[PDB]
Curated annotation (Swiss-Prot):
Recorded family membership: Belongs to the RNA polymerase alpha chain family.
Membrane-spanning parts: none
Name of the protein in its database record: DNA-directed RNA polymerase subunit alpha
Role of this protein: DNA-dependent RNA polymerase catalyzes the transcription of DNA into RNA using the four ribonucleoside triphosphates as substrates.
Portion of the parent chain present: 291 to 330 of 338
Source species taxonomy: Bacteria, Pseudomonadati, Pseudomonadota, Alphaproteobacteria, Caulobacterales
Domain comment as written in the entry: The N-terminal domain is essential for RNAP assembly and basal transcription, whereas the C-terminal domain is involved in interaction with transcriptional regulators and with upstream promoter elements.
Self-association state and partner proteins as the record states: Homodimer. The RNAP catalytic core consists of 2 alpha, 1 beta, 1 beta' and 1 omega subunit. When a sigma factor is associated with the core the holoenzyme is formed, which can initiate transcription.
Length: 40
DNA sequence: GCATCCGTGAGTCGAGGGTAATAAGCAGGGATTCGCCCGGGTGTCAACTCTTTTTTT
């Protein structure tokens, strides 16, 4: 919500599509693979 | 009633890989065919106006 044009209806669809992919809010270390070592 | 002459046959699977020779001449007129170019229908882009789903007030 602290971003310009924070889509109220799109924030729910994006969370739904993220949960459908297998990921959710948090559930991991904060920026674990933040380097280029995780690039495939 | 017999003697003489003309058609069909020849197993079946496999290998091995392409070929080869003669050789007139020129004048008339048409049909054919290749280069350039204008062009009109097909694409690829700057650029002017309604609607509305919110995101902001």
């Amino acid at each position: 919500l602290r971003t310009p044009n924070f889509g109220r209806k799109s924030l729910n669809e994006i969370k739904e599509v993220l949960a459908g992919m297998g990921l959710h809010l948090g559930m991991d270390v904060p920026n674990w693979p933040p380097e280029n070592i995780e690039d495939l």
